[PDB]
Symmetry: D2
Subunit: 256 residues, 4 copies
Amino acid sequence: MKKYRVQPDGRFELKRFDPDDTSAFEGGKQAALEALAVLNRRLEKLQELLYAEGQHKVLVVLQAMDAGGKDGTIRVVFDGVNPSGVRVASFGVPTEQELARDYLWRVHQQVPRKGELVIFDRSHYEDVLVVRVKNLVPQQVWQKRYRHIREFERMLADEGTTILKFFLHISKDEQRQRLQERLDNPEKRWKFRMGDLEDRRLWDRYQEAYEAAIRETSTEYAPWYVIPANKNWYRNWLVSHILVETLEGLAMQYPQ
Amino acid sequence: MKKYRVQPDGRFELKRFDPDDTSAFEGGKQAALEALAVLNRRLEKLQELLYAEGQHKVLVVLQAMDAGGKDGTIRVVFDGVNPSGVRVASFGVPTEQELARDYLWRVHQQVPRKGELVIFDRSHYEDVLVVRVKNLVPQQVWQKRYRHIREFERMLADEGTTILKFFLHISKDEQRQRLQERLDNPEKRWKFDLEDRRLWDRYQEAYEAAIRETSTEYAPWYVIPANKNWYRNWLVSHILVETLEGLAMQYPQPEKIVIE
Amino acid sequence: MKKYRVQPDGRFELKRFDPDDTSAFEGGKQAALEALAVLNRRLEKLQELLYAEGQHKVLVVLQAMDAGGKDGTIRVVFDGVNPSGVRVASFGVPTEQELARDYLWRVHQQVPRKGELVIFDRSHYEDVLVVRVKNLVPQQVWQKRYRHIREFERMLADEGTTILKFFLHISKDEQRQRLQERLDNPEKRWKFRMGDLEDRRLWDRYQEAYEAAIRETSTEYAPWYVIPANKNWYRNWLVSHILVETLEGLAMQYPQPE
Amino acid sequence: MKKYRVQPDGRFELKRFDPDDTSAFEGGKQAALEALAVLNRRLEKLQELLYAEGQHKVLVVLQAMDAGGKDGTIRVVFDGVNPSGVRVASFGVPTEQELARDYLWRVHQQVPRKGELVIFDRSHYEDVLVVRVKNLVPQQVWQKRYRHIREFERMLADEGTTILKFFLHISKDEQRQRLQERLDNPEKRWKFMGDLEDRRLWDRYQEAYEAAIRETSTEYAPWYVIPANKNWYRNWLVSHILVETLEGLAMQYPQPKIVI
């Protein structure tokens, strides 16, 4: 709601958030899945209002550690929404043609148009996290990218884009459970490859990067939301709540 | 159930198909929504296998008269499917940058990649219908486009693309009901043209000719009676799930570890 | 030659520039055609060095009034340059697909990659000129675009893009001659559209827009250059001089393998 | 003039053309550089006619062995032409996002628009050469793309694209000097171990080019073999055939008293 919105004052500290926290919903899994169902219908009717009006642009950014629940959020929260009005843009490791330009070049290509909702499955923030943790570029160049993102997102917002960025917060031990479970599942053993366990060895470094990126790039036009994602039912409900409330705030109407 | 697949013999005539025909499903309406639901979940797990394997490409082409059920088919049949594995490419009237190249230029861009299922809301067949119906180009230039489409689809199929093209068949009277409902629907007045209705019979000759020419083995055409939304949604789901299971996809290999 | 660089002090005024000024070249048209040839040869060897090194990005922005000489600058200055290393990106009136996103969306797509030199035949500055003069958007929204351009260009510069922006300055009277000459040329009337005369009627409004745009967006990382373009020989020479000396300033080197 | 166009009869054999042939021009190295200059200038105003008319599309395909002179052809033949009307599309080794679709996906994106001349520095023919020589795909699957390209090029041509395809032919001995010359040039070594592996497979690249040219040579998209052992002769012949082809299109300036 407003507990998880980080304000643009440069005071954000990541240790003030617990991945197992569930204090916003006065209930358990069975009670939230009832609130998730009613929220999902409101999201479906809001998205058809967004597509019909065709004036607003909605950009949902999902960033999290590996197995943090990015795909789970996309699959569950946007169940039933019209496929012609929502699209997922995934930003993996860059190609040679994409590294030949600025890091914002490939991301700007996928910005939502009018009447469209685009979910960034990993976004331009990958260029201030994995590139910072593994030292793929000097510290001098990515220390300046904090200002580029603030101004790039400001340009989007001033031109009619509503920006929501969610950080799915999971604990270090919970990742050890999900990665071990992903290996012991035939139908999920394929997503994991042994190149994703050294990233876990740099757990503390990715958390300092996420703390700094959120402390710097969270603005009023593009706010950051920290989502405790140790409980899938609570993560799916809280992301659904914040997203639906912001869409109704736009006061959109069907064209006459 | 493959009575609705038209075979590559050049002897196809559309009037043999009745939009109200429902002879493939034994039962009524509500009985089909229970068979559709199990097909829908079979489709969801097949698509996750398509995304996981990452070797096949699935292209679903939807062409139909206006209000024929293209938007209804996409929303209902693909309800619940993972958005990261399915994408809708809508092809309206082309822009000046799209007319500067061939008509296949804008269509080829949206072709599915590996592990992806793409639904063509309209497709390259619009360049063998409206340009033929309204005589926007000479007959000599679009007559050759039957061969271009056959060979463009052959190139896709031979390079690992599974092509399914569904023509949602509705009657002329049923369209008059659906379009008038659009005017009397508060949430649907915005999508809504005398010229498309006035040229109904010509559009039927164009769709019949396009299907007669471009229906091949690697890219077959399916005629779907869409006068009853419940029957069209079940049959397209049946043909799609059957072709997806025909590809016999399997999960990839990881190539035990304690994480610690 | 530093007279034509407008400084980042927010007090640039276009009145102190004369389109007929030629004080940087101590000679005439014939003497400049010999200096242009020597500059053109240096540009050819510099562009192949840019392509060979493959690390720098060079973006040349050309903005000017109608018939101000943008196409003349592209053709003459880049005569002989290898087509594999230079590309022209023209930005006309936007499409509905291009208007569905931000105004910088279509411009960012054409940004040069490493080892490439891209000429913007009109650029994102059209969204603070023709959109400002003709009020295609409210004044509240495009006043914010001065900050977007400064920060978008800083993002490009910090990521390895060398930006050169040239404003070809022609007088109102000289444009009257070139537009009438365009009508009396069999091979050039096609360029003339009947909608080019309302812009001619808004001459002063376009000059206030260009003055404000240059005053706001001229920075140390993306500077503006005012080029007196009433004389094609002086316009072609001066743009060639600033471009060659800026490319040589990068001190690029050939990659030696092994 | 016409001795170098291979006719669409499926008969072409590459050993009939030798890179040292210079039988089409009467004169030496000094006489052709003036004939190249007059052809080059006429090309400059012909391209301005192509851009002004804005109705034709011109596609020039350049394929050749390594160091065969493709970049030299681009640099010299198109020296002075307005950059706003001609564009070079280079097709190197494919990326992952480009391999997820068909091999024609990335090339079809760069096809010339109306009023544009596009130079393909390498093209879709690399997908019937380097993948065939190095066995990146089974022999049965690339046997069919000969048919894909023939029909893809017809689709372009029938929709207003004038296609010119040039194969710059150099001998095995001439390449050995240029690769050693590139090694002994301070300003040119960067272009050069990955290039010497192709020299180990010289003959199989020549058989691949022979099959690709013999199969894909059509009356709508013809192949031209250019002896490129002599740079002065190679640069002149492509300029002659291309300028004659542009004048063959018979383009003219468009049509509209106003005073300011």
